[PDB]
Write a protein that binds this ligand. Structure first.
Ligand SMILES: Nc1ncnc2c1ncn2[C@@H]1O[C@H](CO)[C@@H](O)[C@H]1O
Ligand SMILES: [Cl-]
Length: 284
């Protein structure tokens, strides 16, 4: 069982409302980790214990190359520590902001990685519920590392559960069913995927406003438009994801899952096997 003194801490990598992520080196192994550190008094006082427990439980189930890995947890009297893989290149969002708009090859490659990751997650009966570029990190090789599982949901196989009732997410990416029916499903992540693909090409997500309520109003009306130049096959894909009826989104269980989604013409040139070993295209 590891202890804080087993590590040398370096720079702060980021701060959440209830956490601090610090780069660390484990002394006995020289391995680098991103350690997420939570102050127990704070999580207790602010009723965050279920989210911390959820993050550990969900991440403990994942072993796929496109996710941040949870290697260990420990605690001392004041803090809880999650030892995570270090995604050296940070948030996908950073690259969208700086470049403005990904070319078609880069859009296709990163979309394909996200699709592969969602296929794995949904095959385990897990809904992410907060998929967005800030939560898609990049490792040293520029492969994706999806993170932020405190708001994810393990659907129960015993009850063949399909819907989740907690109200979580981020306004720009939240699904219409969560807003109108008050539940999410695996397909809710496919709505977020559609928003992300749109954002990679257009530079901004499709439902956008300076107030969350204004965004909700547009989501539920499917009020969005495409910029005049938008890769046609990518537009077709987005139009097959941003569908109000969650049972009609390409990739969802009612549409027979990931096979038909991976068969979409936008992905004709993708080699799905060993995608995590392919050299990503350079982002320019
Ligand atoms: N495993 C990680 N590797 C690198 N940076 C991270 C990691 N986890 C979180 N962060 C950074 O810290 C912030 C707060 O969690 C994130 O938005 C991200 O920028
Ligand atoms: Cl930004």
């Amino acid at each position: 069982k590891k202890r804080p003194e087993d590590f040398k801490f370096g720079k702060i990598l980021g701060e959440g409302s209830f956490s601090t992520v610090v780069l660390a080196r484990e002394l006995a192994t020289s391995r680098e980790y991103a350690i997420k550190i939570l102050e127990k008094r704070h999580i207790i006082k602010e009723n965050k214990v279920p989210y911390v427990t959820r993050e550990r439980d969900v991440m403990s189930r994942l072993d796929h190359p496109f996710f941040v890995k949870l290697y260990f947890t420990f605690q001392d009297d004041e803090k809880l520590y999650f030892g995570l893989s270090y995604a050296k290149n940070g948030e996908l969002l950073k690259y969208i902001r700086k470049i403005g708009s990904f070319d078609e090859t880069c859009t296709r490659f990163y979309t394909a990685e996200i699709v592969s990751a969602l296929e794995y997650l949904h095959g385990k009966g897990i809904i992410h519920r907060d998929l967005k570029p800030e939560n898609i990190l990049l490792n040293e090789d520029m492969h994706i590392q999806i993170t932020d599982f405190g708001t994810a949901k393990v659907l129960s196989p015993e009850s063949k559960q399909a819907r989740a009732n907690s109200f979580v997410g981020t306004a720009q990416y939240v699904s219409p069913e969560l807003l109108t029916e008050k539940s999410a499903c695996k397909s809710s992540d496919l709505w977020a995927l559609g928003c992300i693909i749109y954002q990679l090409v257009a530079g901004l997500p499709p439902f956008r406003a300076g107030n969350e309520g204004l965004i909700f109003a547009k989501i539920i009306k499917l009020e969005y438009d495409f910029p005049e130049k938008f890769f046609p096959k990518a537009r077709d894909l987005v139009e097959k994801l941003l569908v109000l009826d969650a049972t009609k989104r390409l990739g969802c269980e009612e549409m027979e899952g990931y096979g038909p989604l991976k068969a979409h013409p936008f992905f004709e040139s993708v080699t799905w096997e060993n995608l995590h070993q392919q050299t990503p295209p350079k982002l320019t």
